[PDB]
Amino acid sequence: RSELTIVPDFYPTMVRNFNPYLATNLRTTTDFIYEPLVVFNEMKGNTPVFRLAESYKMADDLMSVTFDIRKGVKWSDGEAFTADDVVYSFGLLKAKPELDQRGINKWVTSVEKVDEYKVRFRLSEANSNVPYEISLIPIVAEHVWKDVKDPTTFTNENPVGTGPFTVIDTFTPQLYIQCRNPNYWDAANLEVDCLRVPQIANNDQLLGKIVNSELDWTSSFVPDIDRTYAAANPNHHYWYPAAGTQAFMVNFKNPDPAKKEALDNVDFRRAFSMALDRQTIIDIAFYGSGTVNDFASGLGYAFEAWSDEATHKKYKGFNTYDVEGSKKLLAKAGFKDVNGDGFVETPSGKSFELLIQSPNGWTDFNNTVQLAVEQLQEVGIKAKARTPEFAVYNQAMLEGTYDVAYTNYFHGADPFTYWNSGYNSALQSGDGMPRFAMHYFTDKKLDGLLDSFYKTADKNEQLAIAHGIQKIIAENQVTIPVMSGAWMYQYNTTRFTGWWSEENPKGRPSVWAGIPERLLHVLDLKPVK
Numbered sequence: 001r002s003e004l005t006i007v008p009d010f011y012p013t014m015v016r017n018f019n020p021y022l023a024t025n026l027r028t029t030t031d032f033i034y035e036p037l038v039v040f041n042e043m044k045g046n047t048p049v050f051r052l053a054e055s056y057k058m059a060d061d062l063m064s065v066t067f068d069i070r071k072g073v074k075w076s077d078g079e080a081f082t083a084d085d086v087v088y089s090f091g092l093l094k095a096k097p098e099l100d101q102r103g104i105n106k107w108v109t110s111v112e113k114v115d116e117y118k119v120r121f122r123l124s125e126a127n128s129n130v131p132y133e134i135s136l137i138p139i140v141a142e143h144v145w146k147d148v149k150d151p152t153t154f155t156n157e158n159p160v161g162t163g164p165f166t167v168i169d170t171f172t173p174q175l176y177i178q179c180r181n182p183n184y185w186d187a188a189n190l191e192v193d194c195l196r197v198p199q200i201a202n203n204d205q206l207l208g209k210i211v212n213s214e215l216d217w218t219s220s221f222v223p224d225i226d227r228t229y230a231a232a233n234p235n236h237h238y239w240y241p242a243a244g245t246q247a248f249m250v251n252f253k254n255p256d257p258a259k260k261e262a263l264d265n266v267d268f269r270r271a272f273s274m275a276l277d278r279q280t281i282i283d284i285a286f287y288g289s290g291t292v293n294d295f296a297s298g299l300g301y302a303f304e305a306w307s308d309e310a311t312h313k314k315y316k317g318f319n320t321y322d323v324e325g326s327k328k329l330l331a332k333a334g335f336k337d338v339n340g341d342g343f344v345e346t347p348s349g350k351s352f353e354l355l356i357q358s359p360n361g362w363t364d365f366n367n368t369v370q371l372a373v374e375q376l377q378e379v380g381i382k383a384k385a386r387t388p389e390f391a392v393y394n395q396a397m398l399e400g401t402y403d404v405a406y407t408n409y410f411h412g413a414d415p416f417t418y419w420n421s422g423y424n425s426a427l428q429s430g431d432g433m434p435r436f437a438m439h440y441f442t443d444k445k446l447d448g449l450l451d452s453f454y455k456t457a458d459k460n461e462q463l464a465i466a467h468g469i470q471k472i473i474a475e476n477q478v479t480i481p482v483m484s485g486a487w488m489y490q491y492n493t494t495r496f497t498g499w500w501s502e503e504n505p506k507g508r509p510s511v512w513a514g515i516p517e518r519l520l521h522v523l524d525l526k527p528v529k
Ligand SMILES: CC(=O)N[C@@H]1[C@@H](O)[C@H](O[C@@H]2O[C@H](CO)[C@@H](O)[C@H](O)[C@H]2NC(C)=O)[C@@H](CO)O[C@H]1O
Pocket: 007, 008, 009, 010, 203, 218, 219, 220, 221, 361, 362, 363, 364, 365, 408, 409, 410, 512, 513, 514
């Protein structure tokens, strides 16, 4: 039996939860258990790869879109996958908005069933990118979920899915094995029998295992990769294609008076920013992987084609290592040390210590925070590194109780994914939504520009919109962008072949939940002969 050992996420222990709509689920639920209608290859310019749906047609006015369901597709329990499943799934999100992870309810007014295998989504507002948005909404089995009294707490321990791996062959607190859907519609293309998911708590436990060659597919941070991982075995390979932005997010509505006086001050945010030595952070914390990001808008040099150089040039200084500039700005802004501790107090003389959070176990982020704390001390800003578990880290953000948080973002073929997910105020409310836009800075015009991006197909018009977004975010120094990272990815050729690589760059190689292309990737693998 071919078992692919994968690590899409860390856990202190394995807790059986296969609900695709819950943040507490196992990260092998979406894609592998519940296959999407279409998987967009974001690397290749967002090209749709059709799976459960054979085709779709967006109406010319961009106010609706139809999807043709592939016939002959079955759930793991033998029942047919039809339009009823799709209709029910979005109806569920309407019934329980906390299960709405994309904020899709705002855009989709209704989801009508045209026929057994055809559904039509009607929008509340024009969005040519709705197909992509729809593709990220998990679709569950209506014949099963309609009998579930409360979907919000349903742990779905014995999942019925459309994906390649639905059989829970083994489940212990330290390991679970997800095997082949006995009724998989694409069985002929699946050459991996089981997904082996061992329990790993953090980067330290992961390093020990990966160098010992007991893992096949991973996307974790690995220090000194060449010496410690690559040079240790000819079967140890990796490929780090460029990815999105990473930055420090500040909470504009921190409940502490002193902290809010600091964080909700553009001059302080710029001074915080200038204190950071971005290159040293990349060299030290990331071992030279990644590039400096001195775009106040967080755009990133990779997307320079979308940048208005003038805007970049004007705020670039506030996003460049400059100790003197930082200290001079703080003083001019009225931030001074009035109690002799070497740290600046707020203009009204209040003391404060910024708690910078980064998830426990994410050592590359943890090290970045500590480096940042030390760099901030140099400019007189008091800070302390905190490493709460991801759940806590994430929660403190959805509830706005955190101070500052270092985080990465998802990355698409253009800056929209980043700008929209990291700034659309519509994504700042609602349980079930990620952390990305939870800084609580809001602007009507910004939201308007963002929401207008896919209302037109005119690239020159989209560029004009991009420029407008850039300036508003840059002008307000909403976050403190630091760098553009990469899709960390490590593969072992000891047991399987067919992996994506620089030589075979089929798309984002990550195995993390949220990278739907992982379904396509796993379907390219085959055990060694
Ligand atoms: C865009 C995003 O939020 N991606 C998340 C990933 O960062 C995260 O993976 C973890 O990222 C850390 C920071 O680079 C790494 O140190 C850590 O090793 C890595 N963990 C694994 C298992 O690869 C994943 C998993 O928590 O979630 C994504 O949402």
